[PDB]
Amino acid sequence: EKTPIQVWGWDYLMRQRALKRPIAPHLTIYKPQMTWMVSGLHRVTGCAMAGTLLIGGVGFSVLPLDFTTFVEFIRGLGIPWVILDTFKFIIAFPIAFHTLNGIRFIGFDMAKGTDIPSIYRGAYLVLGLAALISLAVVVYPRWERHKKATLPT
Amino acid sequence: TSAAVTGAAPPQFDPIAAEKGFKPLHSHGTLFKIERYFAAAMVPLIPAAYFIHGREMDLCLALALTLHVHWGVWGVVNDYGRPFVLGDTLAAAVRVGAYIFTACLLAGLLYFNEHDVGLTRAFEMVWEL
Amino acid sequence: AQYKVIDHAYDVVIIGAGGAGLRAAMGLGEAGFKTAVVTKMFPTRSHTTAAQGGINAALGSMNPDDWKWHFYDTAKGSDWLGDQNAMHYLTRNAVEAVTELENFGMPFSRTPEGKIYQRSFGGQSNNYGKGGVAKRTCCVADRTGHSMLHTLYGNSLRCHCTFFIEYFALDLLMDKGRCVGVIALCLEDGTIHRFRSKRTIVATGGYGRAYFSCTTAHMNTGDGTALATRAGIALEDLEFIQFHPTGIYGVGCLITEGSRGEGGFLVNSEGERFMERYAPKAKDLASRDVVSRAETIEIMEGRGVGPEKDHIYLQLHHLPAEQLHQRLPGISETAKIFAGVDVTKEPIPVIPTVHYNMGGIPTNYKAQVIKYTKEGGDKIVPGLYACGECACHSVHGANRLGANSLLDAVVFGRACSINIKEELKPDEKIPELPEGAGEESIANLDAVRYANGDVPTAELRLTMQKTMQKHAGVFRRGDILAEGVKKMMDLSKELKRLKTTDRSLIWNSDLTESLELQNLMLNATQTIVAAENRKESRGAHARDDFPKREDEYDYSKPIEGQTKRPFEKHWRKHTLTKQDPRTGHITLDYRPVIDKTLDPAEVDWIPPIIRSY
Amino acid sequence: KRIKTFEIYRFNPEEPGAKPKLQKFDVDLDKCGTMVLDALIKIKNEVDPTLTFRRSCREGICGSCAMNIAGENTLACICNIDQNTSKTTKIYPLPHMFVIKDLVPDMNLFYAQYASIQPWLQKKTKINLGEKQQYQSIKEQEKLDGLYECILCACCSASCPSYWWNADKYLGPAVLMQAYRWIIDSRDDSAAERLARMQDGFSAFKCHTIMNCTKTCPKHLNPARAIGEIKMLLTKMKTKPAPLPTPAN
Numbered sequence A: 001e002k003t004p005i006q007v008w009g010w011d012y013l014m015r016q017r018a019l020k021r022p023i024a025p026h027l028t029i030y031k032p033q034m035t036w037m038v039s040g041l042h043r044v045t046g047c048a049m050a051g052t053l054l055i056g057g058v059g060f061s062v063l064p065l066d067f068t069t070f071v072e073f074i075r076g077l078g079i080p081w082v083i084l085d086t087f088k089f090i091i092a093f094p095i096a097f098h099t100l101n102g103i104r105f106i107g108f109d110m111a112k113g114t115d116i117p118s119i120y121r122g123a124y125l126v127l128g129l130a131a132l133i134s135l136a137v138v139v140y141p142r143w144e145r146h147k148k149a150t151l152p153t
Numbered sequence B: 001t002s003a004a005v006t007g008a009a010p011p012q013f014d015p016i017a018a019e020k021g022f023k024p025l026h027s028h029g030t031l032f033k034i035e036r037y038f039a040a041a042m043v044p045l046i047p048a049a050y051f052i053h054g055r056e057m058d059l060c061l062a063l064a065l066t067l068h069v070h071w072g073v074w075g076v077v078n079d080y081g082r083p084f085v086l087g088d089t090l091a092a093a094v095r096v097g098a099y100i101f102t103a104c105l106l107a108g109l110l111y112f113n114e115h116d117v118g119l120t121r122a123f124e125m126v127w128e129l
Numbered sequence C: 001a002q003y004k005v006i007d008h009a010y011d012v013v014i015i016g017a018g019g020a021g022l023r024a025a026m027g028l029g030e031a032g033f034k035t036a037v038v039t040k041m042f043p044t045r046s047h048t049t050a051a052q053g054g055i056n057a058a059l060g061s062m063n064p065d066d067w068k069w070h071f072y073d074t075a076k077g078s079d080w081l082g083d084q085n086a087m088h089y090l091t092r093n094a095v096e097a098v099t100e101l102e103n104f105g106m107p108f109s110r111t112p113e114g115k116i117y118q119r120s121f122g123g124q125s126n127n128y129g130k131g132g133v134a135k136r137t138c139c140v141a142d143r144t145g146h147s148m149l150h151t152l153y154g155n156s157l158r159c160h161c162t163f164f165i166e167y168f169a170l171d172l173l174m175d176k177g178r179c180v181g182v183i184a185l186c187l188e189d190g191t192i193h194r195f196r197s198k199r200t201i202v203a204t205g206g207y208g209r210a211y212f213s214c215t216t217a218h219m220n221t222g223d224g225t226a227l228a229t230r231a232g233i234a235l236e237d238l239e240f241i242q243f244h245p246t247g248i249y250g251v252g253c254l255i256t257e258g259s260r261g262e263g264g265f266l267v268n269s270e271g272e273r274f275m276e277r278y279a280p281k282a283k284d285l286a287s288r289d290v291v292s293r294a295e296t297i298e299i300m301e302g303r304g305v306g307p308e309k310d311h312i313y314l315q316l317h318h319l320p321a322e323q324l325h326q327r328l329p330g331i332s333e334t335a336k337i338f339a340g341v342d343v344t345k346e347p348i349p350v351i352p353t354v355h356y357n358m359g360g361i362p363t364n365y366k367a368q369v370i371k372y373t374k375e376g377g378d379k380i381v382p383g384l385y386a387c388g389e390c391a392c393h394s395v396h397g398a399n400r401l402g403a404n405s406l407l408d409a410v411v412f413g414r415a416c417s418i419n420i421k422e423e424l425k426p427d428e429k430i431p432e433l434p435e436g437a438g439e440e441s442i443a444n445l446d447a448v449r450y451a452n453g454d455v456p457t458a459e460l461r462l463t464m465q466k467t468m469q470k471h472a473g474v475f476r477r478g479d480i481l482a483e484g485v486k487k488m489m490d491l492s493k494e495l496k497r498l499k500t501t502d503r504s505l506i507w508n509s510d511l512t513e514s515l516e517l518q519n520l521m522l523n524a525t526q527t528i529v530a531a532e533n534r535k536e537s538r539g540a541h542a543r544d545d546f547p548k549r550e551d552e553y554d555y556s557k558p559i560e561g562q563t564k565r566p567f568e569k570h571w572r573k574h575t576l577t578k579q580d581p582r583t584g585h586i587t588l589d590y591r592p593v594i595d596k597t598l599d600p601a602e603v604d605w606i607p608p609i610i611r612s613y
Numbered sequence D: 001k002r003i004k005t006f007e008i009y010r011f012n013p014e015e016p017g018a019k020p021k022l023q024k025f026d027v028d029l030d031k032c033g034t035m036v037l038d039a040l041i042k043i044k045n046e047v048d049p050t051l052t053f054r055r056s057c058r059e060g061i062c063g064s065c066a067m068n069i070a071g072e073n074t075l076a077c078i079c080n081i082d083q084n085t086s087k088t089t090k091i092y093p094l095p096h097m098f099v100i101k102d103l104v105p106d107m108n109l110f111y112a113q114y115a116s117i118q119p120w121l122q123k124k125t126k127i128n129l130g131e132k133q134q135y136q137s138i139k140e141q142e143k144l145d146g147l148y149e150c151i152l153c154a155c156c157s158a159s160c161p162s163y164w165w166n167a168d169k170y171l172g173p174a175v176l177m178q179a180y181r182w183i184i185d186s187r188d189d190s191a192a193e194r195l196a197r198m199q200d201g202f203s204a205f206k207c208h209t210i211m212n213c214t215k216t217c218p219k220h221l222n223p224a225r226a227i228g229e230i231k232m233l234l235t236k237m238k239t240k241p242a243p244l245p246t247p248a249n
């Protein structure tokens, strides 16, 4: 059920709640830094994507108005192409980064590359690499669409 | 002064005795190994889904995703949803949630695969506008 | 004001949780004795953790060695104020007690044959002086001390002790010259605690904070010897303060003697490797009294270094960068942090600093506290024991040998527990407490708590430190002393005019430092009056007005038919200050130095000689 | 002259249900020392002696003075005072600990956990104590490097947002690295039930591989690496056996 230390540890909390000491400040005062932010963003994107998948999967199922007529309930509004691949980027990234960062964390789980430079490059290599495969997947298919609406010789 | 009560020891953890009763065998080791490997094997998949499509992809994509997310939220839920903050019987509630969640996520996707556009195509069917 | 007081009973109670603190706490817990360890900080934080160059044992891991050679180096090192018998028990049990520590979990640095790495140090030799520089100092490279305290603490967790973490030992508890336990303020909630115990062990560390610049920790305020003085014990040999040669010029935190035995040296303004002249044979690896002196002469005779020409250089840059990392990583580093110095390319600014306190609570080889009257030898204070820095079995004499200190800690630690099993016999029950015992210890606490004079506690500590710094330093004069002594007694006076601000019990940092300020003053004064009276130069105590070592004979000449000077005329005797704690009068008195070993068949006693290096 | 301004967490438990506050303190840096602890010592020995914080060693080797300065966790005694007198260096206690008083947190949970790893050499075939040193190759003693040095200061753990949330079950980086410190000791025979101990969901595995632990260590150690390395053992990488004690030992 619980290792003995875990038993003892609970007793501690109760004992400290008993003495009404205040809990020292922690998140509001900890220096913003790459280590916990990228860890943040990983969880954030994680949940958000599962979030959508639930409220979208379940959403369209127990709801009258299906998905094909959603694609219409939008395009028929006067949708600026600029803001349309701001939207498609906002989607590619959380997938691209979570996957990229993901492989990274498995690095950490098996002790590979935990020195502060690998820690700090990983974060930069994975962030930019997300935005690259996120950009060149939104703007790349907008070359078999906005080149075939103008093109020279 | 000369009015003193008799005192007990300080709360202190006993590494020997209080660690020779309790011993229960159940390893979460073995199991962690699998949730990593799956998440790993799940790499080619996300690339491959950007290309190959259809009911077949839809299926395993939204079947594996259910599992990855099932584990994930569990992890999350287990972190924040802590008894010292919610009292024992609310913490139990949220832990059930993480499975209720995991159930609807499946149902939801499995419907949307069989009955709406499917997954893979529901992305084509956005990435063009 | 109103106070909560608390009572426990133990078989033995230990004040101190350092090297000797625990090693004895180990034996006693394991021997099935109900043990309480009272410590005024989490035991890891203790000073032992700060130790460096290693711990000595004749392990033979670099060259053949004999515990007996080590012995000899210890008698010599002590300039024969050392108790031959006490030094014996130390030198003999060394190889075991170090070995033991390995067995315990201590990750010693290692030799290619998988044995414990030993390294040279200050003032040791093979074959009773004859042979070359010795290699006896076993070490966890550069942070031995850190690892010793950490193993001990760990290994103590399986020996059933009741640990009383951050509790402040106010006073010993007396009854007709027999210690029945201890009284401490609990730091956390603010209670007061009385421990009835059958024996009590004092292992509180030293008082290196009585000086202005030292290598000791802020908690090294010498509190045990305070309790000892307060309990009506004399202290021994207080005047022998050991000046470490190599302390960082600015702050004064230690750079190991290791850096020397590893192949480094001191350098002056010219560039001269000067130690060659002040000691031809053992050079930069002479005893730390000789060397710290040499430095101070070089300094004062002009050849100092840097902006004020007031310290010398410890040059390590001439040494292979590899072995400099794999053998000195922490000093390498604390040199970069504090001196802002790269050790591979420049030297470290170093200056002798107050280090270790040979002096302390007197004992026999059995590590039992003694009161000595001239009429009836040393009689033992019932059920009181002391070990480590704060004791004076005098194993160190006039000058503690480098790295005999963690040995002394562990060995006599071990000794306490061994010796208490043999003498406490469990028919003897846990003593009752004299009608309201140490109600006055609790009193003196109220007085300092609500202290309201004109002079802050901060302020008193500083001049007492500074005056000690001038008037009691490396080289001293009969007047420059007398002159400190006066300024000094004037402070024990100024104690009434004490000023604090904090009125709380729950972790009163201020309140406790002021209790410490009290405890130091006792040590200080005593030190200086003990020093003021010794008219000879010996080990770490060097009078310009009496350069000679004042032995019975003059050991410069044959000895055949020379009349033995009487006890009252020569200086081979332990100083023994008896301080009345409320006025602060100090009477002296002088105990003979013990010259017989433990068994003259095992090792024969070592007779005095002219102490050169 | 140079007025540095420090902003310090303050709490009096004796004040009848008081609350936390910050309190500004001004310090002339040429009449002061060079490291934060100096400036604390100073502003308690000159301005306000009701300022309370642990310390001892003055060269960052005891562990006492660990607190949160300038946003991250470190040792007051060895981090430099920020000489830019326009900025304002702000000092809190180890994040998310229960505060006895001022800059003093309650450490006891963290001390318990440490003693739960059973941090002592334990051997399979009991040996006679003082008798002889056990064999250990120099290269396998080196496996303890970056492991033994830990001053048990709790900077890491108190930066770890998992130890924040579940310190009662989650063991935290400090203790964890040390639990590991003992398993890879070639001299240690319990390697097997040493892992067996932290075999469950929280104690070891609630490390979300976040990296404040490695990134904050004032001793430039790296517990993340060792937590990771433990994972490897709770599964699929077994610990090397003891090379054989050669003859003449």
Ligand SMILES: *Cc1cc2c(cc1C)nc1c(=O)[nH]c(=O)nc-1n2C[C@H](O)[C@H](O)[C@H](O)COP(=O)(O)OP(=O)(O)OC[C@H]1O[C@@H](n2cnc3c(N)ncnc32)[C@H](O)[C@@H]1O
Binding pocket: C015, C016, C017, C018, C019, C020, C021, C038, C039, C040, C041, C043, C046, C047, C048, C049, C050, C051, C052, C053, C054, C055, C144, C145, C167, C168, C169, C170, C203, C204, C205, C206, C215, C216, C217, C219, C222, C223, C224, C254, C355, C356, C387, C388, C389, C390, C402, C403, C404, C405, C406, C407, C409
């Ligand atoms: C200062 C120093 C000393 C030192 C050294 C390096 C430095 C910087 N390197 C050494 C070395 O390389 N080799 C060696 O042999 N010695 C070295 N030394 C000297 C040696 O470390 C010390 O002398 C040794 O640690 C002595 O051990 P001991 O156990 O006697 O001293 P301690 O470790 O400081 O113990 C302190 C304990 O006493 C408790 N205490 C004190 N007063 C109280 C009160 N009033 N109430 C409760 N507890 C008290 C402390 O709490 C602590 O637990």
Ligand code: HEM
Binding pocket: A042, A043, A044, A045, A046, A047, A048, A049, A050, A053, A095, A098, A099, A102, A103, A105, A106, B039, B040, B042, B043, B046, B065, B068, B069, B071, B072, B073, B075, B076, D207, D208, D209
């Ligand atoms: C190859 C692709 C993926 C990889 C390699 C991967 C990897 C990981 C890993 C290693 C974790 C655990 C973090 C930890 O506990 O230390 C995690 C957590 C999580 N994942 Fe993914 N994942 C992938 C795809 C996805 C996708 C597409 C989603 C969205 C549906 C997702 C949702 C989540 C959630 C909600 C968590 C919660 C755990 C946490 O935040 O710590 N994952 N993922």
Ligand SMILES: CC(C)Oc1cccc(NC(=O)c2ccccc2C(F)(F)F)c1
Binding pocket: A026, A027, A028, A030, A036, A039, A040, A043, B079, B080, D159, D160, D161, D162, D165, D208
């Ligand atoms: C200010 C920084 C240091 O602190 C922040 C504060 C808020 C929570 C977090 N980060 C998490 O909470 C987090 C993120 C990803 C995975 C696991 C966690 C977990 F387990 F819960 F620790 C970090």
Ligand code: SF4
Binding pocket: D149, D150, D151, D152, D153, D154, D155, D156, D157, D173, D174, D177, D216, D217, D218, D219, D220, D221, D222, D223
């Ligand atoms: S690894 Fe470093 S940060 Fe962590 S407890 Fe040890 S000394 Fe502190």
Ligand code: F3S
Binding pocket: D159, D160, D161, D162, D163, D172, D173, D206, D207, D208, D209, D210, D211, D212, D213, D214, D224, D227
């Ligand atoms: S920050 Fe926490 S997640 Fe593990 S990597 Fe360090 S203990």
Ligand code: FES
Binding pocket: D054, D055, D056, D057, D058, D059, D060, D061, D062, D063, D064, D065, D066, D075, D076, D077, D078
């Ligand atoms: S005071 Fe020694 S660790 Fe900071």
